[PDB]
C-alpha cells in the first residue's frame, strides 16, 4: 500500500465549527480523504482513543519518520502561562509550539487559528492570540468563521501535491481569497443602481435589494462565498442577510457593529 501523508490536527480555543466545516467536503467526501489521501493521525473530535492512549497517539505521530503536516483549529490563550486552555494537563500554547517546530507545513483552519478569532475580541480576557501572532511561525491561513470546506480541502490537496499556493498579505491562498465577496455578488446590480433595503421587513428587502445599508461587509471582505456557495445550496446574502466580514483579521472588532457601516 502507498504511504499516505501524516496529518496532525490540533484543537485550541475553538467552537469546533472548523472541524464541522471540514467534514462537509464532497470533493472528495471525508471518508475518501482519510482512507485514500491523508493519514489523519490525531483529531480529538473523531479519534477512537482517549486520555493517555490519545496522548500517546499524538506523540507517536509527532515522532513519525516520514514527518507530518500540522492543522490548527482555534486560537491560543496566553494568560496565566497558557493555563486557561489545557489538553492532557499541558497548555495549548506549549503543545502547538512543539508540534509547529517539526511540521512540514502549518495550515490554520479558521479565523481563530489564523488571526485570534472570537476569544480575542475586546477585552480579550484570556489574552488569546493567532498561531503566527503568538509563535512567530509562518502559517497558511484558511479563514472564515468557519471557512468553506472547498477552501480548506483545496489548500490541503494543493500542499500535498503541488507545493505552497500563492498567498496574499494575510497568508491566505489567492486561489480562494483573491476576490471580494462583493465583486461576485448577484445583488451587485442593485448596489450599482443605489437600490438598498432600509430594513429586513421592507419591500426592498423582499425584492432582494443590496444589503449595504444594513451593514453588509461584502465590499471589504475577501472570500469566494457567492461563487462556490455553502452546502451546495446557499450563502448568507442569498438568505437575505449581510456579510459579517468573517474571513477578515479581527473582524469581531473591525466589522462591528454588524448592522452598520463605518
Amino acid at each position: 500500500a502507498k504511504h499516505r501523508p501524516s496529518v496532525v490536527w490540533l484543537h485550541n480555543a475553538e467552537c469546533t465549527g472548523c472541524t464541522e466545516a471540514a467534514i462537509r467536503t464532497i470533493k472528495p467526501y471525508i471518508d475518501a480523504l482519510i482512507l485514500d489521501t491523508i493519514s489523519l493521525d490525531y483529531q480529538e473530535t473523531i479519534m477512537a482513543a482517549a486520555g493517555e492512549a490519545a496522548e500517546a497517539a499524538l506523540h507517536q505521530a509527532l515522532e513519525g519518520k516520514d514527518g507530518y503536516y500540522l492543522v490548527v483549529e482555534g486560537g491560543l490563550p496566553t494568560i496565566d502561562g497558557g493555563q486557561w486552555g489545557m489538553v492532557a494537563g499541558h497548555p495549548m500554547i506549549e503543545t502547538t509550539k512543539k508540534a509547529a517546530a517539526k511540521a512540514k507545513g502549518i495550515i490554520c483552519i479558521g479565523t481563530c487559528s489564523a488571526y485570534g478569532g472570537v476569544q480575542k475580541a475586546k477585552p480579550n480576557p484570556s489574552q488569546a492570540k493567532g498561531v503566527s501572532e503568538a509563535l512567530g511561525v509562518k502559517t497558511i491561513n484558511i479563514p472564515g468563521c468557519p471557512p468553506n470546506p472547498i477552501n480548506f480541502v483545496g489548500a490541503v490537496v494543493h500542499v500535498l501535491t503541488k507545493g505552497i499556493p500563492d498567498l496574499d498579505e494575510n497568508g491566505r491562498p489567492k486561489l480562494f481569497y483573491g476576490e471580494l465577496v462583493h465583486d461576485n455578488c448577484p445583488r451587485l446590480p442593485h448596489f450599482e443602481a443605489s437600490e438598498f433595503a432600509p430594513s429586513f421587513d421592507s419591500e426592498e428587502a423582499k425584492k432582494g435589494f443590496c444589503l449595504y445599508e444594513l451593514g453588509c461587509k461584502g465590499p471589504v471582505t475577501y472570500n469566494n462565498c457567492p461563487k462556490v456557495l455553502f452546502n451546495q445550496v446557499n450563502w448568507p446574502v442569498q438568505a437575505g442577510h449581510p456579510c459579517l466580514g468573517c474571513s477578515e483579521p479581527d473582524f469581531w472588532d473591525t466589522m462591528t457593529p454588524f448592522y452598520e457601516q463605518g
Binding site: 500500500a1 467552537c15 482513543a49 482517549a50 438568505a239 462591528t256
Partner: protein, 545 residues
Amino acid sequence: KPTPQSTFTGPIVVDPITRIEGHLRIMVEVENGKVKDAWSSSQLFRGLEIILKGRDPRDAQHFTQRACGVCTYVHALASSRCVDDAVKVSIPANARMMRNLVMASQYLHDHLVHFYHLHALDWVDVTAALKADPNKAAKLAASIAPARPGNSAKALKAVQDKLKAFVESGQLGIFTNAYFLGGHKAYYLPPEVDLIATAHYLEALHMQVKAASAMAILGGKNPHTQFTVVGGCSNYQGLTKDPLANYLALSKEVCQFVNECYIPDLLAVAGFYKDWGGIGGTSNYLAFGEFATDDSSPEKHLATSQFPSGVITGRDLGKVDNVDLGAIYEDVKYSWYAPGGDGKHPYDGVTDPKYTKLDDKDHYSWMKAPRYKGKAMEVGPLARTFIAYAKGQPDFKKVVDMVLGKLSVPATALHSTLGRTAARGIETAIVCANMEKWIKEMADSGAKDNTLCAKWEMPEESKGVGLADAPRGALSHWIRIKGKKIDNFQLVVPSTWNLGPRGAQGDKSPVEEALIGTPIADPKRPVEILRTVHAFDPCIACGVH
C-alpha cells in the same frame, strides 16, 4: 455472563475525553473495579459573556453562535429570542415556523453525527468487523432492519475490503490506540453487528452532508447560520416553493436513514448491552420545551412547546411541575471564578475568571454549576423524553413504548446510560415524523403571506430571556440592556447543567452522579467512563463559553 469488572482500586484520569466537542478532563476514584467518586473538569475558558459587555444588542447573536459549531445555530436562536423579548417584539408566524424548522434540521444532523461518529466507537469494535462473514451479516441485517441495498452482502463486503486495506496499511489514523484493539471484555457485539454498524458509520459521513444542506436552505449556511434578525428572519427565499421542495426532499432522505439505519442500530446495540440499563442513572430532569406554536414570549414558549417543558424530581413521573425561571441560579464555589459569586440568578450573573491549579478538588472546572432550588438537573433528550412521556405526549408515548417493547425492559430502565442513549434516537424519530407536516405549514403560510420580520424599537433600558431546548437540552440566554447597550449578557447552557462541577452544597452534577457505580473491566482502557460521558453528549465550548 455478568458485566465485566476488574478489582482495580485507585484513581483514573481521562484527558482528553475525545469524541465530544471541546476540552474535558474526567477524574474518578475506583474501588474494587467500580467508580466511587467523580469529577467533571472543563479545561478551556473563552469568556463570551465578558466580550459582549458594552456591545450592540443586535450583535449578540453573532458572537454567541460561536459558543459552538457542533450545536451551530442554537445560540443565534437563543440570542434572537432573548433580544426579541428584551425589545418586546412578537415575531411573525412565518419567522416562528422558519426558526423552528432550522432547529428541527439541527436535531437531525446533530443526533445522527453523535450516535455514529462520537458515541458508536464505545460500543462497536471496528477491527472485529473484519472477522465477519458478509453473508451472515447480510442475513442478520435483513432480519433486524428494513431491507435496503446498503445492507446486501455485496455492500457489506465492500466495506470490509476497504477497511481491510486501511488496517493492512499500518496507518490506523483515527483508530490508532483504540480501546478495542486486540479485543476488550466490555465490548459485547458479534463481528457481524460490528460490520453492519461500521458500514452505516461510513454511510452516515455522507448523510450528514445532506442533513446540513437541508439546514442551509433555510439557514443560509452550515456551520454558523446567518438568517435570523431582531424581529424575525431575513430569508424570504426560504418561504418559496422550489427551495422548500428541495428541503423536503433532502429531509426525507435523512429521515429514511434515521428509520432504516440509526434506530435499528440503536436497538441492536441496546439489545446486547441490556446491563447498561442499570448503570449511569440520575433522578432530576428539566426542559424549556421546543417547537412551540406560540413563541411571542418566554411564557408562551414554556406553555406551547410541542416537545413540552417541565420539571421532574426524584424520578417521580406522576408529578411534572412548571419551570420556575425565578428558581434558576448558578454557583461557582467549585469553579474557576472569584469566590463569593454563588447563588446568582442569570439576570444578576457574574463572570469573574480565577484559575487555581489542575486537579484542585476545591476549584476544578471552567463551568459554573447551575442549580434549581438547590438541585442538580439533567437536561437533554432523556429529560425531554421523560417529561413528554409523563405528560402523555402521543408521539413520545408511542415511540417509547415501541422501544421498551422491542427491548423488553420496564420504563424505569430508562434512568440509565442506555436510556439516555435510546432517548436521543427516540426523539430523532419523532422530529422525522413531524418534518412533512411542519414544512407544509410554512410552505402554505409563506405562499399566502410572505411577512417574515416585524418592526421593533431599541429601548434605553430593558431585560429579556431567550429559551430553547437545543439537542443537548435546556438553553437560556439572559440580557440586561442599559443605555441601548449590553450591560449584562449571561448564557446558561445544557452542558453547563449536565457537566458542570459541584454546587455550593458540594452536591455532584448529573454526569458526576451518573459516573458513580460505573464498572471498569480494564483500567488501562476505561471505555465504561466514555460510554456514560458521551451519552450526555458533552459540549464544553457550550458549557463554558
